[PDB]
């Protein structure tokens, strides 16, 4: 059973979180299940950047981002080679380590 690790984040998960999950688990859904309140402005349909995360371990196990996701990621703060939209990340067969970025696009409540 793959482990997902959320790295510590001052706002969303100060102590971090490590959890065993089934293959096919959605990262955004998992975060919300554990009250890691990652924003999901567009409702998880690859139309914002608020669920931006960086998959620092296990990125290469994941299904490749589609064009819609890649186009949104081009707009994100702090884009990296392992950036993903959290709403589109589904755990496969390997452990993942997820960093939630410190910064994001400034937007209205």
Q: Please, which residue, 37 or 70, has the CB nearer to its own copies?
A: 37
CB 49 within 8 A of CB 77: yes
Q: Please, which residue, 15 or 93, has the CB nearer to its own copies?
A: 15
Per rule CB under 8 A, is residue 34 in the interface with its own copies? no
DSSP string spanning 56-95? EESGGGSPPP-HHHHHHHTTSTT--TTEEEGGG-B--SS-
Q: How far apart are CA 51 and CA 27, in angstroms?
A: 10
Q: Please, which residue, 17 or 85, has the CB nearer to ligand FES?
A: 85
Please pick, from the candidates 3, 47, 79, 92, the single residue that binds ligand FES as defined by CB under 6 A.
47
Q: Which residues bind ligand FES (CB under 6 A)?
A: 40-42, 44, 46-48, 50-51, 72, 85, 87
């Amino acid at each position: 059973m793959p482990l997902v690790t959320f790295l510590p984040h001052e706002k969303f998960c100060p102590e971090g979180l490590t959890v065993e999950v089934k293959p096919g688990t959605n990262i955004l859904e998992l975060a919300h299940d554990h009250h890691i309140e990652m924003e999901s402005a567009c409702g998880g349909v690859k139309a914002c950047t608020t669920c931006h995360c960086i998959v620092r371990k296990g990125f290469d196990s994941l299904e490749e981002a589609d064009e819609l996701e890649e186009d949104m990621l081009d707009k994100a703060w702090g884009l990296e080679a392992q950036s993903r939209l959290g709403c589109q990340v589904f755990v496969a067969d390997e452990d993942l380590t997820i960093e939630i970025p410190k910064y994001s696009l400034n937007h209205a409540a």
